[PDB]
Amino acid sequence: PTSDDIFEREYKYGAHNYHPLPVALERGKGIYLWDVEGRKYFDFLSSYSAVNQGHCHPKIVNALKSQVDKLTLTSRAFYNNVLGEYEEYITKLFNYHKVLPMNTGVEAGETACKLARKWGYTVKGIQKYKAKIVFAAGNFWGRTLSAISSSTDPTSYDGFGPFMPGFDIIPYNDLPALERALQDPNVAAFMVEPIQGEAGVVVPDPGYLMGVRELCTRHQVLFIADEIQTGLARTGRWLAVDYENVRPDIVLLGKALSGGLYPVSAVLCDDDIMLTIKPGEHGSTYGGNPLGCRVAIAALEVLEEENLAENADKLGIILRNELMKLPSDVVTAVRGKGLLNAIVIKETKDWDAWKVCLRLRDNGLLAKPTHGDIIRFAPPLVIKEDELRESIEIINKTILSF
Amino acid sequence: PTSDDIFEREYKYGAHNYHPLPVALERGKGIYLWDVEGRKYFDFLSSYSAVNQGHCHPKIVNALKSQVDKLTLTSRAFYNNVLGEYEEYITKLFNYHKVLPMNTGVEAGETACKLARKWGYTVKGIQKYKAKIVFAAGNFWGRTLSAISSSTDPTSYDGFGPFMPGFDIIPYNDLPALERALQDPNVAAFMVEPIQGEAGVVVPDPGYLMGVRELCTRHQVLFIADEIQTGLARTGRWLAVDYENVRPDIVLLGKALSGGLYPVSAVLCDDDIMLTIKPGEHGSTYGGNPLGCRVAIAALEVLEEENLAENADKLGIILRNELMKLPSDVVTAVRGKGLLNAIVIKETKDWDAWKVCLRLRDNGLLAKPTHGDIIRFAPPLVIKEDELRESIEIINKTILSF
Numbered sequence A, B: 001p002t003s004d005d006i007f008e009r010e011y012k013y014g015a016h017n018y019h020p021l022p023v024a025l026e027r028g029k030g031i032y033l034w035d036v037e038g039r040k041y042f043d044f045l046s047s048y049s050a051v052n053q054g055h056c057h058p059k060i061v062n063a064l065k066s067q068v069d070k071l072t073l074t075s076r077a078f079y080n081n082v083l084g085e086y087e088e089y090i091t092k093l094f095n096y097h098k099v100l101p102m103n104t105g106v107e108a109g110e111t112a113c114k115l116a117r118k119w120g121y122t123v124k125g126i127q128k129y130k131a132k133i134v135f136a137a138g139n140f141w142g143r144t145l146s147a148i149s150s151s152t153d154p155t156s157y158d159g160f161g162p163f164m165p166g167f168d169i170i171p172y173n174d175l176p177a178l179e180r181a182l183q184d185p186n187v188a189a190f191m192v193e194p195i196q197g198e199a200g201v202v203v204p205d206p207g208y209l210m211g212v213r214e215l216c217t218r219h220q221v222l223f224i225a226d227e228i229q230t231g232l233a234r235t236g237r238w239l240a241v242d243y244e245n246v247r248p249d250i251v252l253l254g255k256a257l258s259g260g261l262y263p264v265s266a267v268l269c270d271d272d273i274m275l276t277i278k279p280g281e282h283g284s285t286y287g288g289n290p291l292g293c294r295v296a297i298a299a300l301e302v303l304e305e306e307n308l309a310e311n312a313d314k315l316g317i318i319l320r321n322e323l324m325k326l327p328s329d330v331v332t333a334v335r336g337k338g339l340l341n342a343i344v345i346k347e348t349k350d351w352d353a354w355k356v357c358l359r360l361r362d363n364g365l366l367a368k369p370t371h372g373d374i375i376r377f378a379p380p381l382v383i384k385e386d387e388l389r390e391s392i393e394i395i396n397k398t399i400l401s402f
C-alpha cells in the first residue's frame, strides 16, 4: 500500500478534474498530517479553512459519534429535535432572525441568489425575471453553472455551455464601480467576499466593506457576504466584516462550520428577506440533518470558547511580520488577515510556486499554489506560537534553498 | 423538551422553506423511528430513499466511527488513501471507466450537465455555448438555479430570477417527443429519471428506456440517467435501467450511497466523456473526502451482500398486490417498482392526502404526500415480510377509517 499506487490508481479509476500535490495523506490530528509512509507534515492549507479547529478535533468527533448512534437523517419532510437547536444557536450567535441550512458552499450561494431574486420581485418590485445580481471580479463561490457564470477565471467557465443571465461583474475593491452598477433599479443584490481567497488572498483596502454597505443600503440592494472561507475565526473575528463593524443583509457560512467532519453550510439573514421563500419553494435532502447539526454546534462551540479568533489574529500578526523579513527580490508581496495569508513569488523559468510547494512538502509543510506565483499559508487555528515559528523556519529553509 | 416546542422554535429561528408533517423524530434504527415522546413509527419515506439500508445501519456506523478517528477531510488539493479505494470499488461495481465524486444530488446533476456540454464542444463539435440539454417534463434533480430552470413545477421556479438557457423540456414517457427533440444537432444530452419519484412515482411504459438509449445513440446524444433516488436496490436492481438491460452514457447516484450518514453523490461515465474535464476545471471541497468514501463503501457493501435488491423486489410485489385490494372508489391507482410505490387518492373536500398522512401518523406510520392526492410508500429495504404486512394493516386501518 504505497503512495505511487494511490496516485496511479486514482488516475485510472477517478476523474481527472484535479491536479493535486503528490502526497497521500492517511492520518490527521490538530495541525499535523501523516502520509501512508509515516512522514509527518505541517498542514498550512486547512482544507481551504475547512478544518480551522484542526483535524479531528475531539469535541466534534464525540458529538458525531454520539449522534450517529441515535439518528442520522429523517429528511425535512418531518421534524427532528436537533435542527432547530442548531438554528437557534447559530442565529443568536451571529444575531440574525433566521438561518437556512444547506450542505455545501455552492448551495449556500445558490440559496442567497434565490433569496435575493425572490426578495427583488416580492419586496423591491422588480418586473419578474428582470432582476440582476452583481459579483466582484475574481470571485469564487463554487463551481455550479450559476457559480461559474459569474466567474472571470477561464478554467472555471470555458466550455461549459451557455451562461446564467442576470449576472453582472464589477472589479473587486472598487467603490465607484459598485456605485455605477447599483444605479440600475433591477439590481437586487451584490455578492462579495470580504477577502477573495481563491484569487490569491486579495485583501481590499480599509473602508471598502463600509462603503459597500453604504452603497447597498442607499440604493436598496442586498449586501451578500460570502464568509464560507473567510468567516469562523480564521481572519481573527467571527466574520471578516466584523473588522469594519459592517452588518451584511445576507451572510454565508461553510467549511469550518463542521471542522471537516460533515458538509454543513448556512445562510443567515433577517425575516423580511428570509420569509420571501414560502414552504416547499427551496430546500435540500441532507440540508439540516441532525448529525450535521450536532457537529455544527460542536464546531461553533469549540470555535468560541477555545479562543481561536484572537489566537489566529496574534499568530497571523507574527506570521506576516516574519514572512516580510525574506528579501524583496524573491518574495514580491506578503498579504493577509488572521491566519489567512499569502505570498507572491517572483516567478521565472528558474522556479515557480509549484516547485516551492514540492520542496516544502519535502521539508514537512503542505501548501497550495493558486496561480503559479502565489502561495497561501493557512494553518489550523489550534496551532501555537512555537509550532508556528517552527513552521516558518521550514518556510524560510525552503525559500532560501533556491 | 416537548414536540410543540420544537415546532414553534423551528418556526421562529428557522426558514419557512418547508411544511413538514407534525412529528419530531429523535431516534431511528432499521425501519423504525421514535419521536421525543417515545412513540414508535414505521418509516415509509426512507428520507426519500436515502436510508435504504435502514436508519443507522451498524456496518456503516462502524465505518464512520473508524474513519473519524483517523482522517476526515484533506481537500482534493492533496491525495488521500480512501477516495481512490471507493472510486475503484464503485467503478468496478457498476462497470464504468471513471467516477466523479460530489456531495449532494444537485452537484451530481450539475456535474452531468457540465460533462455533457464540455463533451458536446470538444467531441461532438457543437459551436461553443450553443449546446442544449433535454429534460423530461415533471423531472426533479434538485433545487439550484439550473435545476429549477428545467422544472415544470411552479413552486420550484416561480419568482427565482431569469432562467438557464439551453434547457429544453419534452413530455415524460414519450418516444416521439424525444425523437423530434434529438433532431437538433446542438442537443448534447438528454437527462431523465427511470422512475420520476418527486412527481408521484410516475413509471414509464415498458421499453421506454430501451427506446431512449436507441434514440440517444442514433442521434449522438448522451443518455443521462438520474438514479439518485431510483438506484441502489430500491426498485429491485442496482439501477432501475437494469430492468431493461440499458447502459446509460452517464449515471447519477446519491442519497442511499451513504445510508443517510453523509452527503455523498457520484457521477459514473466512461473515459471519452469523463476526461473532457481537465484538471482544475471542476470539483468540490468536500467532494471525495475520506470519511464519506468509507461510509459509501460500507453502504454499497451492505447493499450488495445483505441481499436487498431482490428483497425489495419481492416485498414490493407483495406491497402492490396488497394495496390493489382496497376499493377503486377511494384508491384511484396503485403504481411503483420494488419498494418505491405510490397510490392515488380520490381527493374531495371530505379528505385529502395530507389528512391521511396525519391519521397514518396517529396509527404509527409516516408517509409523504406529493400533490394532495398522491401518497408514496417507500420503507427501508431491510424491512421483512411480517413487518411489511403489519405496516400494510396500518395502511388499510387508516384508509378504511374515512
Ligand SMILES: *Cc1ncc(COP(=O)(O)O)c(C*)c1O
Binding pocket: A048, A103, A104, A105, A106, A107, A109, A140, A141, A142, A143, A193, A197, A198, A226, A227, A228, A229, A230, A254, A255, B283, B284, B285, B286
Ligand atoms: C465564498 C465561497 N463559497 C463557496 C466555496 C466552495 O464551497 P463548496 O466546495 O461548494 O463546499 C468557497 C470555498 C468559497 O470561498
Ligand SMILES: *Cc1ncc(COP(=O)(O)O)c(C*)c1O
Binding pocket: A283, A284, A285, A286, B048, B103, B104, B105, B106, B107, B109, B140, B141, B142, B143, B193, B197, B198, B226, B227, B228, B229, B230, B254, B255
Ligand atoms: C434524481 C434526483 N436528483 C437530485 C435529487 C436531490 O438531491 P439533493 O437534495 O440535492 O441531495 C433528487 C432527490 C433526485 O431524485
